[PDB]
C-alpha cells in the first residue's frame, strides 16, 4: 500500500517515508489532502514532486505550495505518475496553474479528461524533421530579416513599453489564422498584475480563444515556478503530436526558469556550480528545450524572453539559453517612439535561418541589401547631424532616400491594433515582402512620399495609399 | 607617499626631524605636480622649479645594496 508518513518539513522541502518496495519514482506527484480533525489543526490541500531517494525508505520532495500546517505523520497519497495536466480542446481559452487546474472562475475540468505527464523524454533522433523549414509569420521584419524556424527557439529582447505583448499577440493571431495552429503562453515566474493585463488584452482582442495560458508566478514556491514551462509545453505537445499542427509556445522570462532551478537546487542541498547556478543548469535547460523541436507530425516553435542579468551575455544563464536559440528579435524603444510597429531593431536582429541554403538566394540578397542600406544610413546619421541633410553626395542622398523608405516599409498594421486604429491589418506572405523590398531597392517607388510607407502591409497597398494621399 | 609611520617624528632624532619635515613637503609637492607634466602644455617656471627640487629629492633618496649610511 502506497500510504506514507511525513518525516521532515523544512521550508519548501518535505521528506516523506513509505514502506519498503512501495517507494514512488522520481518526479512523481504526491498529494496531501488532510481535513482538520480538531481546532489545533489546519485544512491542507498540497502536492509534492519527488526529487530524491534518501535511503531508509525516505523520499525528499519539493513542494508546489505553502507547507504551513503540515504535521509529522500526516499521510500522503502516491499518485503513481508525475503531475498529470489536462490536454486537448478543453485547455484553449483557459488560464491554468502548474498543476493543470483553472485559475479562471469559468469552471472545473472533469475527471474523465485526458491528462498527459509533465515529465516526458525528448523526441528521439528517428522522430525529428530532417529539413529546416521556415515558420511564416506575416510580420515583415520577422520573416524578412530574422526568419523563424518551425522547431526554433527565438529570443525576445526588450520589454517595458516597446510592444512585446502586441508582438506576441499578433504572432498568435497570424499563426492561428494562416497556419491553423494554436499557441500556449507559459508565464514562468513573472508577476501577477502583468499576467492579469496580458489576460485582459487577449480577452478583448479575441486572441485568447485560440491560446492556452499557464501562469506560475512569483508568489509560488521555487518548485512551482520551475515546472511552469514544462506544464505549458506538455499542452503544446498535445497539438504537436495528436493533432499534428504547428504550435507556438511563449515563455515569458526564461531566466526565471533558470533561477527557480537554482533555488530548488539550493533548497535540495547541492553544491553550487559556476557562479550561483545549479550543477544541472545545462541539463535542466536541455530537458526543457529539446522537447521544443520539429517532428514529422508537427512542430513547436518557441518565442522566449531573456533577461540577461548584469548586462552580461556571458553569464551562464544567458550563455546556456543562447546555445539553443535560433533567432533574436531585438525590440527597440527608438523605433517605437519613431512610429514603427513592430519595434524590431532590423540591424540587431539576427537569425541562423537567414542563409541562402535555407530560405533561398533572392530572399538572402534582398535581406542583405536591406541590412547594408540601413547600416550605411545609421553611419550617415552623424554626417547628416553635423553637416545637414543636403551636400553629402549624390549616392549618400540616394541611399538615405531609399533607406528611410525601407525603414518605414518595415512597419505593419496589425490585426490586434485594429481595435485601436480602425484599419484592418494585414498578413504579408514572404514572397510579397521580398518582392516589395526588391522593388524599393531598385528605385521603383522613389517618387512616392515616404509617409505612405508607414504602417501598411504590401507594396500594392502603398501604391493605393500614395494615390489616396 | 603611501608608506605611513604611525609613531613617526617621536622616533626620529631632532636633527632628522627639522629637515625631514620639509623633505616630506617637497616630495609631496613633486608627487602632486608630476601628474600634470606627463603630457600637454609645459608648466610654468615655479612649478618646474619644484619639479626639479622633487627630482633631486628622488635622486637623494636612492641607495645601493648592503651599504647603510649613519645618521649624521
Amino acid at each position: 500500500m502506497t500510504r506514507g508518513r511525513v518525516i521532515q518539513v523544512m521550508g519548501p522541502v518535505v521528506d516523506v517515508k513509505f514502506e519498503n518496495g512501495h517507494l514512488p519514482a522520481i518526479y512523481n506527484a504526491l498529494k496531501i489532502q488532510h481535513k482538520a480533525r480538531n481546532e489545533n489543526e489546519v485544512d491542507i490541500d498540497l502536492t509534492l514532486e519527488v526529487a530524491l531517494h534518501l535511503g531508509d525508505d525516505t523520499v525528499r520532495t519539493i513542494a508546489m505550495a505553502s507547507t504551513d500546517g503540515l504535521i509529522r505523520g500526516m499521510e500522503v497519497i502516491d499518485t503513481g505518475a508525475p503531475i498529470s495536466v489536462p490536454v486537448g480542446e478543453v485547455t484553449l481559452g483557459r488560464v491554468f496553474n502548474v498543476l493543470g487546474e483553472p485559475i479562471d472562475l469559468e469552471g472545473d475540468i472533469p475527471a474523465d479528461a485526458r491528462r498527459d505527464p509533465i515529465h516526458r523524454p525528448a523526441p528521439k533522433f528517428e522522430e525529428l524533421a530532417t529539413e529546416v523549414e521556415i515558420l511564416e509569420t506575416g510580420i515583415k521584419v520577422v520573416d524578412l530579416l530574422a526568419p523563424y524556424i518551425k522547431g526554433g527557439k527565438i529570443g525576445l529582447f526588450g520589454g517595458a513599453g516597446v510592444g512585446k505583448t502586441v508582438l506576441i499577440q499578433e504572432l498568435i493571431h497570424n499563426i492561428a489564422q494562416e497556419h491553423g495552429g494554436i499557441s500556449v503562453f507559459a508565464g514562468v515566474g513573472e508577476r501577477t498584475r502583468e499576467g492579469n493585463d496580458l489576460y485582459h488584452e487577449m480577452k478583448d482582442s479575441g486572441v485568447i480563444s485560440k491560446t492556452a495560458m499557464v501562469f506560475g508566478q512569483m508568489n509560488e514556491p521555487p518548485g512551482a515556478r520551475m515546472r511552469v514551462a514544462l506544464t505549458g509545453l506538455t499542452m503544446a505537445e498535445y497539438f504537436r503530436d495528436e493533432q499534428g499542427q504547428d504550435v507556438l509556445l511563449f515563455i515569458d522570462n526564461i531566466f526565471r526558469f533558470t533561477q527557480a532551478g537554482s533555488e530548488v537546487s539550493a533548497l535540495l542541498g547541492r553544491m553550487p556550480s559556476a557562479v550561483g547556478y545549479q550543477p544541472t543548469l545545462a541539463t535542466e535547460m536541455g530537458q526543457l528545450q529539446e522537447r521544443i523541436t520539429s517532428t514529422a507530425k508537427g512542430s513547436i516553435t518557441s518565442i522566449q524572453a531573456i533577461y540577461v542579468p548584469a548586462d552580461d551575455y556571458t553569464d551562464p544563464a544567458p550563455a546556456t539559453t543562447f546555445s539553443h536559440l535560433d533567432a533574436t528579435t531585438n525590440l527597440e524603444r527608438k523605433l517605437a517612439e519613431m512610429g514603427i510597429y513592430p519595434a524590431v531593431d532590423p540591424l540587431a536582429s539576427t537569425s541562423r535561418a537567414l542563409a541562402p541554403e535555407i530560405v533561398g538566394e533572392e530572399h538572402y540578397q534582398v535581406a542583405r541589401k536591406v541590412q547594408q542600406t540601413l547600416q550605411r544610413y545609421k553611419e550617415l546619421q552623424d554626417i547628416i547631424a553635423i553637416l545637414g541633410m543636403d551636400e553629402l553626395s549624390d549616392e549618400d542622398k540616394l541611399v538615405v532616400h531609399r533607406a528611410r523608405r525601407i525603414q518605414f516599409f518595415l512597419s505593419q498594421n496589425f490585426h490586434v491594433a485594429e481595435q485601436f486604429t480602425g484599419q484592418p491589418g494585414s498578413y504579408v506572405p514572404v514572397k510579397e515582402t521580398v518582392r516589395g523590398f526588391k522593388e524599393i531597392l531598385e528605385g521603383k517607388y522613389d517618387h512616392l512620399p515616404e509617409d505612405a510607407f508607414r504602417l501598411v502591409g504590401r507594396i500594392e497597398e502603398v501604391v493605393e495609399k500614395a494615390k489616396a494621399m | 607617499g603611501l608608506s605611513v609611520s604611525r609613531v613617526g617624528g617621536a622616533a626620529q632624532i631632532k636633527a632628522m626631524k627639522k629637515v625631514a619635515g620639509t623633505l616630506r613637503l617637497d616630495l609631496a609637492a613633486y608627487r602632486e605636480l608630476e601628474a600634470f607634466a606627463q603630457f600637454g602644455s609645459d608648466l610654468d617656471k615655479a612649478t618646474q622649479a619644484k619639479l626639479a627640487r622633487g627630482a633631486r629629492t628622488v635622486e637623494v633618496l636612492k641607495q645601493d645594496l648592503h651599504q647603510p649610511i649613519p645618521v649624521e
Binding site: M271, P272, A274, V275, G276, A310, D312, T314 | -
Partner: protein
C-alpha cells in the same frame, strides 16, 4: 592664417573624436574584464561559503 586656424580647430575636433573612440573601446574591453572578474568573484565566494558549510556536517 585664417585657413590655418580653421584647419587647427578641425584637427583638434578630429583628435578629440578619435580620443573618445579610443576611450569607448577601452570601456568595452574593461567591461568584458569586469564581467569576467565579477563572475570569478561570485563563484569564489560561494565556493568558500559552501566549503565552510560542508566542513561542519
Amino acid at each position: 592664417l585664417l585657413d590655418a586656424k580653421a584647419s587647427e580647430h578641425a584637427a583638434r575636433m578630429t583628435a578629440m573624436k578619435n580620443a573618445t573612440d579610443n576611450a569607448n573601446e577601452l570601456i568595452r574591453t574593461l567591461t568584458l574584464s569586469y564581467n569576467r572578474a565579477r563572475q570569478a568573484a561570485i563563484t569564489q565566494e560561494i565556493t568558500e561559503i559552501v566549503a565552510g558549510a560542508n566542513a561542519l556536517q
